[PDB]
Short mmCIF file of C-alpha atoms and ligand atoms in Angstrom, two decimals:
data_model
loop_
_atom_site.label_atom_id
_atom_site.label_comp_id
_atom_site.label_asym_id
_atom_site.label_seq_id
_atom_site.Cartn_x
_atom_site.Cartn_y
_atom_site.Cartn_z
CA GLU A 1 14.99 -20.06 -0.85
CA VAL A 2 14.99 -16.74 -2.84
CA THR A 3 15.10 -13.41 -1.15
CA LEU A 4 16.10 -9.81 -1.84
CA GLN A 5 16.10 -7.48 1.25
CA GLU A 6 16.46 -3.65 0.76
CA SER A 7 17.82 -1.44 3.52
CA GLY A 8 18.97 2.15 3.81
CA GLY A 9 15.77 4.17 3.12
CA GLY A 10 13.83 6.51 5.29
CA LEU A 11 13.69 10.30 5.55
CA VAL A 12 16.34 12.26 3.66
CA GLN A 13 16.93 16.00 3.15
CA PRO A 14 16.03 17.54 -0.27
CA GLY A 15 19.32 17.97 -2.05
CA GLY A 16 20.90 15.41 0.34
CA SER A 17 22.32 11.86 -0.38
CA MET A 18 21.23 8.36 0.61
CA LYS A 19 22.51 4.94 -0.48
CA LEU A 20 20.06 1.98 -0.65
CA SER A 21 21.40 -1.54 -0.36
CA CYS A 22 19.87 -4.86 -1.38
CA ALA A 23 21.15 -8.24 -0.17
CA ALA A 24 20.44 -11.28 -2.30
CA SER A 25 20.28 -14.89 -1.37
CA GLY A 26 18.86 -18.12 -2.63
CA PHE A 27 19.72 -17.70 -6.31
CA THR A 28 22.88 -17.17 -8.36
CA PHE A 29 23.32 -13.44 -7.87
CA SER A 30 26.49 -13.24 -9.87
CA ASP A 31 24.68 -14.34 -13.09
CA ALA A 32 21.66 -12.02 -12.57
CA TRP A 33 21.17 -8.50 -14.08
CA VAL A 34 19.80 -6.44 -11.15
CA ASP A 35 17.47 -3.44 -11.15
CA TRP A 36 15.76 -0.82 -8.99
CA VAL A 37 12.04 0.05 -9.66
CA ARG A 38 10.21 2.62 -7.53
CA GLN A 39 6.59 3.33 -7.04
CA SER A 40 4.85 6.74 -6.58
CA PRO A 41 1.31 8.05 -6.73
CA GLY A 42 1.41 9.78 -10.09
CA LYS A 43 3.48 7.27 -12.03
CA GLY A 44 2.72 3.91 -10.58
CA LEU A 45 5.68 1.64 -11.08
CA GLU A 46 8.73 3.27 -12.54
CA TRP A 47 12.02 1.60 -13.63
CA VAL A 48 15.07 3.36 -12.20
CA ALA A 49 18.30 1.74 -13.05
CA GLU A 50 19.99 -1.55 -13.90
CA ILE A 51 23.50 -3.04 -13.55
CA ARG A 52 24.44 -6.06 -15.65
CA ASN A 53 26.52 -9.03 -14.63
CA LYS A 54 30.32 -9.30 -14.98
CA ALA A 55 30.06 -11.15 -18.27
CA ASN A 56 28.24 -8.19 -19.65
CA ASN A 57 30.89 -5.73 -18.38
CA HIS A 58 28.72 -4.62 -15.30
CA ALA A 59 27.20 -2.05 -17.67
CA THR A 60 24.68 0.40 -16.15
CA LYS A 61 21.61 2.01 -17.61
CA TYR A 62 19.40 4.72 -15.92
CA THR A 63 16.06 6.31 -16.50
CA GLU A 64 16.44 9.94 -17.85
CA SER A 65 15.20 11.71 -14.71
CA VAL A 66 17.93 10.21 -12.43
CA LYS A 67 20.88 10.08 -14.78
CA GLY A 68 23.84 11.83 -13.37
CA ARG A 69 22.31 11.91 -9.90
CA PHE A 70 22.00 8.20 -9.03
CA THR A 71 24.64 5.51 -9.39
CA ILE A 72 23.90 1.82 -9.32
CA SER A 73 26.68 -0.65 -8.31
CA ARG A 74 27.12 -4.26 -7.17
CA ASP A 75 29.42 -6.31 -5.04
CA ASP A 76 29.18 -9.94 -6.15
CA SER A 77 31.29 -11.08 -3.22
CA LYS A 78 28.57 -9.87 -0.86
CA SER A 79 25.70 -10.76 -3.34
CA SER A 80 24.50 -7.15 -3.07
CA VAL A 81 23.44 -4.27 -5.32
CA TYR A 82 23.30 -0.60 -4.23
CA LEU A 83 21.65 2.63 -5.42
CA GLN A 84 23.59 5.72 -4.38
CA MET A 85 21.18 8.65 -4.69
CA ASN A 86 22.47 12.26 -4.81
CA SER A 87 20.76 15.60 -5.22
CA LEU A 88 17.49 14.09 -3.99
CA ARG A 89 14.24 15.84 -5.05
CA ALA A 90 10.65 15.56 -3.87
CA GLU A 91 9.94 13.59 -7.08
CA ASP A 92 12.31 10.88 -5.78
CA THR A 93 9.99 10.13 -2.86
CA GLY A 94 8.52 6.60 -3.14
CA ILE A 95 8.96 2.96 -2.25
CA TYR A 96 12.11 1.53 -3.88
CA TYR A 97 12.30 -2.17 -4.73
CA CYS A 98 15.41 -4.22 -5.57
CA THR A 99 14.46 -6.86 -8.32
CA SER A 100 16.54 -9.20 -10.52
CA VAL A 101 16.35 -10.95 -13.94
CA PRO A 102 18.15 -14.19 -12.90
CA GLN A 103 18.55 -15.59 -16.39
CA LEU A 104 17.83 -14.59 -19.88
CA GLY A 105 14.08 -14.01 -20.65
CA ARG A 106 12.92 -14.48 -17.04
CA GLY A 107 11.65 -10.97 -16.46
CA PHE A 108 11.81 -9.35 -13.00
CA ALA A 109 11.44 -12.65 -11.24
CA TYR A 110 12.40 -11.88 -7.65
CA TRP A 111 11.57 -8.68 -5.84
CA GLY A 112 12.56 -7.35 -2.44
CA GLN A 113 10.07 -6.07 0.18
CA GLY A 114 10.58 -2.39 -0.68
CA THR A 115 12.06 0.54 1.30
CA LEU A 116 10.25 3.88 1.64
CA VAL A 117 12.35 6.95 0.77
CA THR A 118 10.81 10.28 1.91
CA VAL A 119 12.57 13.38 0.64
CA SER A 120 11.51 16.08 3.05
CA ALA A 121 13.08 18.79 5.21
CA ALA A 122 10.52 18.06 7.98
CA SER A 123 11.99 16.27 10.99
CA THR A 124 11.39 12.93 12.63
CA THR A 125 8.70 13.05 15.32
CA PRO A 126 7.32 10.27 17.53
CA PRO A 127 3.62 9.33 17.66
CA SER A 128 1.22 9.67 20.65
CA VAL A 129 -1.16 6.67 20.97
CA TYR A 130 -4.71 7.01 22.30
CA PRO A 131 -7.06 4.06 23.04
CA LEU A 132 -10.46 4.21 21.51
CA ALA A 133 -13.06 2.45 23.65
CA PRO A 134 -16.90 2.25 23.11
CA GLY A 135 -19.05 4.81 24.84
CA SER A 136 -22.02 2.50 25.93
CA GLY A 137 -22.60 -1.09 27.23
CA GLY A 138 -21.87 -3.91 24.74
CA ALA A 139 -25.05 -5.79 23.54
CA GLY A 143 -24.08 -6.32 20.67
CA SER A 144 -22.43 -9.62 19.83
CA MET A 145 -19.24 -8.00 18.48
CA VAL A 146 -17.55 -4.83 19.81
CA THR A 147 -15.18 -2.53 17.92
CA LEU A 148 -12.23 -0.91 19.68
CA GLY A 149 -9.50 1.25 18.16
CA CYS A 150 -6.17 3.05 18.63
CA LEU A 151 -5.55 6.63 17.37
CA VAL A 152 -1.84 7.13 16.43
CA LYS A 153 -1.10 10.84 15.81
CA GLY A 154 1.59 13.40 15.48
CA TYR A 155 4.35 11.32 13.96
CA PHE A 156 6.70 11.77 11.03
CA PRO A 157 7.69 10.29 8.60
CA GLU A 158 5.73 7.16 7.73
CA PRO A 159 5.46 4.26 8.46
CA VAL A 160 4.25 3.11 11.89
CA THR A 161 3.40 -0.63 12.47
CA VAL A 162 0.33 -1.38 14.58
CA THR A 163 -0.52 -4.83 15.99
CA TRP A 164 -3.13 -5.93 18.47
CA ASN A 165 -2.10 -8.30 21.41
CA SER A 166 1.28 -8.49 19.78
CA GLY A 167 -0.22 -10.10 16.68
CA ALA A 168 -2.45 -12.63 18.43
CA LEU A 169 -5.49 -10.60 17.14
CA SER A 170 -5.29 -10.01 13.37
CA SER A 171 -8.39 -11.34 11.66
CA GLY A 172 -10.82 -8.54 12.78
CA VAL A 173 -8.26 -5.66 12.38
CA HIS A 174 -8.30 -2.78 9.84
CA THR A 175 -5.27 -0.45 10.11
CA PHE A 176 -6.12 2.49 7.82
CA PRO A 177 -3.75 4.63 5.70
CA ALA A 178 -2.44 7.60 7.64
CA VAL A 179 -3.59 11.17 6.76
CA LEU A 180 -1.17 14.05 6.78
CA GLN A 181 -2.05 17.65 7.86
CA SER A 182 -0.89 20.37 10.42
CA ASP A 183 -0.53 17.77 13.22
CA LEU A 184 1.63 15.67 11.03
CA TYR A 185 0.48 12.03 10.34
CA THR A 186 -2.74 10.70 12.02
CA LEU A 187 -3.75 7.05 11.59
CA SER A 188 -6.49 4.86 13.11
CA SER A 189 -6.51 1.09 13.59
CA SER A 190 -9.67 -0.72 14.57
CA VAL A 191 -10.18 -4.29 15.94
CA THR A 192 -13.48 -6.14 16.25
CA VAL A 193 -13.83 -8.98 18.69
CA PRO A 194 -16.67 -10.78 20.42
CA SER A 195 -18.27 -9.02 23.41
CA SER A 196 -17.19 -12.23 25.25
CA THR A 197 -13.56 -11.38 24.59
CA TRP A 198 -13.38 -7.73 25.61
CA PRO A 199 -13.32 -6.28 28.34
CA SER A 200 -12.80 -9.63 30.08
CA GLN A 201 -9.51 -10.13 28.20
CA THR A 202 -6.82 -7.47 27.82
CA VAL A 203 -6.77 -5.94 24.34
CA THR A 204 -3.72 -3.78 23.77
CA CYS A 205 -2.56 -2.02 20.61
CA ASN A 206 1.18 -2.09 20.06
CA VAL A 207 2.56 0.74 17.97
CA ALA A 208 6.09 1.01 16.65
CA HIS A 209 7.60 3.96 14.70
CA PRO A 210 11.06 2.70 13.47
CA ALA A 211 12.09 6.28 12.39
CA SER A 212 12.14 7.46 16.03
CA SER A 213 12.62 4.08 17.65
CA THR A 214 9.39 4.67 19.53
CA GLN A 215 7.38 1.73 20.83
CA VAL A 216 4.12 2.23 22.77
CA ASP A 217 1.63 -0.35 24.12
CA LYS A 218 -1.83 1.07 25.13
CA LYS A 219 -4.52 -1.07 26.73
CA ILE A 220 -8.08 -0.42 25.65
CA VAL A 221 -10.08 0.08 28.87
CA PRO A 222 -13.84 0.61 29.28
CA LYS A 223 -14.69 4.28 29.64
CA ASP B 1 9.87 5.56 -24.72
CA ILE B 2 7.53 2.64 -25.35
CA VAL B 3 4.07 3.38 -23.98
CA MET B 4 2.14 0.59 -22.19
CA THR B 5 -1.60 1.17 -21.99
CA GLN B 6 -4.05 -0.68 -19.72
CA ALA B 7 -7.37 0.95 -20.69
CA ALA B 8 -9.46 -0.45 -17.80
CA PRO B 9 -8.46 1.26 -14.52
CA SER B 10 -10.34 -1.60 -12.80
CA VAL B 11 -12.48 -4.58 -13.66
CA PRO B 12 -15.34 -5.95 -11.43
CA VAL B 13 -15.59 -9.75 -11.22
CA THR B 14 -17.57 -12.31 -9.24
CA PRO B 15 -15.61 -15.20 -7.62
CA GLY B 16 -15.80 -18.46 -9.76
CA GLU B 17 -16.05 -16.67 -13.11
CA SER B 18 -13.42 -16.31 -15.84
CA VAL B 19 -12.07 -12.81 -16.64
CA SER B 20 -9.54 -11.08 -18.85
CA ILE B 21 -7.36 -7.95 -18.59
CA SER B 22 -5.89 -6.28 -21.62
CA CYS B 23 -2.65 -4.34 -22.26
CA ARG B 24 -1.31 -2.72 -25.45
CA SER B 25 2.16 -1.48 -26.33
CA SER B 26 3.01 1.38 -28.65
CA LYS B 27 5.68 -0.66 -30.39
CA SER B 28 5.88 -4.39 -31.14
CA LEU B 29 7.62 -6.14 -28.14
CA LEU B 30 8.99 -8.85 -30.44
CA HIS B 31 12.84 -9.04 -30.13
CA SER B 32 15.30 -10.08 -32.87
CA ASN B 33 16.04 -13.09 -30.85
CA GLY B 34 12.45 -14.18 -31.39
CA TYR B 35 11.11 -13.68 -27.88
CA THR B 36 8.32 -11.18 -27.01
CA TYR B 37 9.22 -9.16 -23.99
CA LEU B 38 5.93 -8.54 -22.25
CA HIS B 39 5.48 -9.63 -18.57
CA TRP B 40 2.59 -9.43 -16.12
CA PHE B 41 2.78 -8.59 -12.41
CA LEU B 42 0.42 -8.61 -9.44
CA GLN B 43 0.77 -6.09 -6.59
CA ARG B 44 -1.48 -6.93 -3.69
CA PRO B 45 -2.37 -4.13 -1.38
CA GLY B 46 0.63 -3.14 0.87
CA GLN B 47 3.02 -5.73 -0.68
CA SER B 48 5.75 -5.65 -3.37
CA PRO B 49 4.90 -6.52 -6.98
CA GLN B 50 5.40 -10.22 -7.84
CA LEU B 51 5.83 -11.73 -11.30
CA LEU B 52 2.84 -13.70 -12.63
CA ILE B 53 3.70 -14.30 -16.29
CA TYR B 54 6.90 -13.77 -18.17
CA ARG B 55 7.20 -13.42 -21.99
CA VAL B 56 3.50 -13.39 -22.73
CA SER B 57 2.43 -16.85 -21.65
CA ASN B 58 4.88 -18.47 -19.32
CA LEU B 59 3.64 -18.82 -15.80
CA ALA B 60 6.19 -17.98 -13.12
CA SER B 61 7.08 -20.34 -10.29
CA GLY B 62 4.44 -20.65 -7.66
CA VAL B 63 1.80 -18.83 -9.68
CA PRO B 64 -1.71 -20.51 -9.58
CA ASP B 65 -2.74 -22.54 -12.66
CA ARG B 66 -5.78 -20.28 -13.01
CA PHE B 67 -3.63 -17.59 -14.71
CA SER B 68 -2.72 -17.63 -18.44
CA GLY B 69 -1.53 -15.01 -20.85
CA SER B 70 -1.74 -14.52 -24.65
CA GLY B 71 -1.02 -12.00 -27.22
CA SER B 72 1.44 -10.82 -29.80
CA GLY B 73 2.96 -7.73 -31.24
CA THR B 74 1.22 -4.91 -29.51
CA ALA B 75 -1.75 -6.56 -27.87
CA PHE B 76 -1.85 -8.88 -24.81
CA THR B 77 -4.32 -10.41 -22.45
CA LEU B 78 -4.02 -11.80 -18.93
CA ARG B 79 -6.87 -14.26 -18.12
CA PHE B 80 -8.12 -15.85 -14.98
CA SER B 81 -9.98 -19.22 -15.59
CA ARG B 82 -11.84 -18.80 -12.25
CA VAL B 83 -11.34 -15.74 -10.02
CA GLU B 84 -10.98 -16.09 -6.27
CA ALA B 85 -11.71 -13.32 -3.64
CA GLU B 86 -7.97 -13.38 -2.72
CA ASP B 87 -7.12 -12.16 -6.26
CA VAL B 88 -7.81 -8.54 -5.31
CA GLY B 89 -4.87 -6.31 -6.24
CA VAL B 90 -3.50 -4.32 -9.17
CA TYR B 91 -2.31 -6.11 -12.28
CA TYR B 92 0.43 -4.50 -14.36
CA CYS B 93 1.94 -5.36 -17.75
CA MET B 94 5.52 -4.28 -18.44
CA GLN B 95 7.63 -4.14 -21.64
CA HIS B 96 11.16 -5.50 -21.06
CA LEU B 97 12.33 -4.91 -24.72
CA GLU B 98 14.05 -1.55 -24.62
CA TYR B 99 15.30 0.96 -22.05
CA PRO B 100 13.78 2.57 -20.20
CA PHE B 101 11.61 -0.49 -19.24
CA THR B 102 8.03 0.81 -18.89
CA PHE B 103 4.93 -0.40 -17.05
CA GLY B 104 1.21 0.00 -17.87
CA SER B 105 -0.82 2.05 -15.30
CA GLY B 106 -2.32 -1.19 -13.95
CA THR B 107 -5.86 -2.59 -13.72
CA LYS B 108 -7.32 -3.12 -10.27
CA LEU B 109 -9.35 -6.30 -9.90
CA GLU B 110 -12.48 -5.57 -7.80
CA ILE B 111 -14.44 -8.54 -6.42
CA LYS B 112 -18.16 -8.20 -6.57
CA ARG B 113 -20.16 -9.52 -3.55
CA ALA B 114 -23.59 -8.98 -1.91
CA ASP B 115 -24.28 -5.55 -0.54
CA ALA B 116 -23.28 -5.08 3.11
CA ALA B 117 -24.14 -2.03 5.34
CA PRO B 118 -21.33 -0.40 7.32
CA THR B 119 -20.86 -1.19 11.05
CA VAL B 120 -20.52 2.32 12.26
CA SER B 121 -18.76 3.16 15.58
CA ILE B 122 -18.09 6.49 17.03
CA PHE B 123 -15.59 7.40 19.72
CA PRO B 124 -15.54 10.33 21.95
CA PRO B 125 -12.11 11.85 22.51
CA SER B 126 -10.08 9.76 24.88
CA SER B 127 -9.61 11.35 28.29
CA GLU B 128 -5.86 10.92 27.68
CA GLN B 129 -6.13 13.02 24.55
CA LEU B 130 -8.20 15.75 26.32
CA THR B 131 -5.66 16.29 29.04
CA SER B 132 -3.23 17.00 26.15
CA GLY B 133 -5.53 19.71 24.64
CA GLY B 134 -6.78 17.51 21.83
CA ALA B 135 -10.18 16.40 20.94
CA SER B 136 -10.24 14.09 17.91
CA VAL B 137 -13.59 12.31 17.46
CA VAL B 138 -13.12 9.10 15.49
CA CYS B 139 -15.72 7.28 13.42
CA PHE B 140 -15.13 3.84 11.78
CA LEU B 141 -17.50 2.81 8.96
CA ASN B 142 -16.45 -0.83 8.55
CA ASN B 143 -16.89 -3.88 6.36
CA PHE B 144 -19.36 -2.49 3.83
CA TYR B 145 -20.00 -3.03 0.11
CA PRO B 146 -20.19 -1.49 -2.47
CA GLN B 147 -17.17 0.77 -2.03
CA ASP B 148 -18.66 4.23 -2.16
CA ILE B 149 -19.83 5.87 1.05
CA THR B 150 -20.42 9.41 2.30
CA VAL B 151 -19.74 10.83 5.72
CA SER B 152 -21.12 13.91 7.26
CA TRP B 153 -20.23 15.22 10.65
CA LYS B 154 -22.58 17.32 12.76
CA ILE B 155 -21.84 19.31 15.85
CA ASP B 156 -25.17 20.20 17.72
CA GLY B 157 -26.94 19.47 14.48
CA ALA B 158 -24.76 21.84 12.32
CA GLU B 159 -22.69 20.27 9.55
CA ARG B 160 -18.96 20.51 9.89
CA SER B 161 -16.62 20.10 6.89
CA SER B 162 -13.17 21.43 7.81
CA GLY B 163 -10.84 19.47 10.02
CA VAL B 164 -12.19 16.10 8.81
CA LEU B 165 -9.48 13.48 7.95
CA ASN B 166 -10.76 10.54 5.85
CA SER B 167 -8.88 7.32 5.01
CA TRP B 168 -10.07 4.10 3.16
CA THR B 169 -8.80 0.58 3.13
CA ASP B 170 -8.21 -1.44 0.01
CA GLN B 171 -10.78 -4.17 -0.73
CA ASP B 172 -10.50 -7.03 1.84
CA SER B 173 -8.87 -10.20 0.38
CA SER B 174 -11.13 -12.56 2.42
CA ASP B 175 -14.56 -10.95 2.61
CA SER B 176 -14.40 -8.43 -0.27
CA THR B 177 -15.61 -5.55 1.86
CA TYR B 178 -14.28 -1.97 2.28
CA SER B 179 -13.80 0.12 5.50
CA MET B 180 -13.32 3.83 6.10
CA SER B 181 -12.01 5.92 9.08
CA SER B 182 -13.23 9.57 9.44
CA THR B 183 -11.74 11.74 12.19
CA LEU B 184 -13.15 15.10 13.19
CA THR B 185 -10.15 17.06 14.47
CA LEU B 186 -11.07 19.63 17.17
CA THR B 187 -9.03 21.38 19.91
CA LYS B 188 -10.18 20.73 23.49
CA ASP B 189 -11.47 24.35 23.68
CA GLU B 190 -13.61 23.86 20.53
CA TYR B 191 -14.74 20.42 21.73
CA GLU B 192 -16.25 21.91 24.89
CA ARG B 193 -18.25 24.72 23.12
CA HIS B 194 -20.75 22.07 22.01
CA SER B 195 -22.38 18.83 23.06
CA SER B 196 -23.86 16.74 20.15
CA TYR B 197 -21.37 14.87 17.90
CA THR B 198 -22.70 12.79 15.15
CA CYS B 199 -21.12 10.77 12.46
CA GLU B 200 -23.66 10.18 9.75
CA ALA B 201 -22.98 7.67 6.95
CA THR B 202 -24.92 7.52 3.73
CA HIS B 203 -24.44 4.33 1.72
CA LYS B 204 -26.47 2.50 -0.92
CA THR B 205 -27.66 -0.02 1.59
CA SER B 206 -30.10 2.41 3.22
CA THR B 207 -32.24 5.27 2.17
CA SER B 208 -31.76 6.77 5.62
CA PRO B 209 -28.26 7.97 6.76
CA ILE B 210 -26.79 5.62 9.48
CA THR B 211 -26.37 7.81 12.55
CA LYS B 212 -24.02 7.30 15.46
CA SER B 213 -23.70 10.03 18.04
CA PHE B 214 -22.88 10.92 21.62
CA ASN B 215 -22.97 13.86 24.03
CA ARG B 216 -19.91 15.43 25.50
CA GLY B 217 -21.92 16.12 28.64
CA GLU B 218 -21.97 12.30 29.23
C1 BCG C 301 15.48 -7.48 -24.27
N1 BCG C 301 16.46 -8.05 -23.25
C2 BCG C 301 17.79 -7.37 -23.16
C3 BCG C 301 17.55 -6.07 -22.37
C4 BCG C 301 16.25 -6.40 -21.43
C5 BCG C 301 15.93 -7.87 -21.80
C6 BCG C 301 16.68 -8.90 -20.90
C7 BCG C 301 16.33 -10.36 -21.21
O1 BCG C 301 16.53 -10.59 -22.47
O2 BCG C 301 15.96 -11.20 -20.45
C8 BCG C 301 18.20 -8.60 -21.00
O3 BCG C 301 18.96 -9.63 -20.29
C9 BCG C 301 18.83 -9.91 -19.03
O4 BCG C 301 18.14 -9.30 -18.23
C10 BCG C 301 19.70 -11.05 -18.62
C11 BCG C 301 20.56 -11.69 -19.56
C12 BCG C 301 21.42 -12.77 -19.08
C13 BCG C 301 21.38 -13.14 -17.71
C14 BCG C 301 20.48 -12.49 -16.80
C15 BCG C 301 19.66 -11.45 -17.29
C16 BCG C 301 18.74 -8.40 -22.36
#
């Protein structure tokens, strides 16, 4: 059962420090050469650093733009690799993925889920959540409801509907940033026979501020 | 640095047909050890990249038989024997010969399907938002195809352009449609100075804009 799980990201001050971790399991970590790749709009996927295995003297290699600022390291006894990031810049903002080359010629075979790093002096702010219910009477066959999530920072927020029980007719859109901070919409379409007879609630979480909010969509 | 080029920024394909994606390197990726270090990855919308093919033609574990790769030196091709609607995503090639490792810019696979008009819904500001001094009017243009659409907002018939926040979803992996959210951001004071709020969508499926509107006074 192979998995790589990154932790340690989130909002960080420009010029500040942050150390990402990545825990491996399900494969022989000690033989693998392990790398960090990040993604940004502007470069797409970008290789960051690599640390080799003990047999290859744990050697490290870094991309030019982070050399001297980032340090990659590993602790085979905990099957983990780390990326200590110093002197953080806006160009360092992106999703960072832990990935490994388990054996010679295998390529980046296993990847973690990714951890968003946002290099910004702005501060963490919770979201407000507003139900979006139809103006008129339904009918017809299907009705669309929504939840407006606004005023939060940084990304991401997770939105579910009926705690996950409704997912097939949901579109949670990318958030938009402007003066009010982030603003995101999520819509859900269900039969007119489901709502308003059944409770439809959107559940919003914002891990940065540890905010959780459940809002029921009620006919207006 | 070695430069990886994926000319096509996207490629449109109909489910059931075969298709190929090309990648070129600026240097031969053939190593002294005899292996060619070129791999292919898929990144579905909102997920991490995942390896599809390592060293030109070797399928990775769990990858569908429909994928294959070929190529040599500086030119490579990823092929699908039969595409499926769930194949939407961005496909990247990467050279793993020299440091720094480098990736192509990716080619987005776009599934072609029958045209579909948007289901357009408009929402007056929630009373909860109004008590807080806010008046965002939200409009969803959902499940439409092809992907381009235009949205115009009108307040008592006059067009409004500033304060509009637009967001688009990636192509749906099950039904190959696209959706868009458009929010007109107003303060409560501004909201009350007028009464007609319309979200008008123009899309290839109709010669007439699709209009959804309401009146504040109701
Ligand atoms: C061109 N080579 C060089 C540099 C990139 C690529 C890669 C590869 O050859 O697979 C490297 O080695 C590994 O990543 C590896 C070796 C043993 C065990 C686990 C991983 C060796």
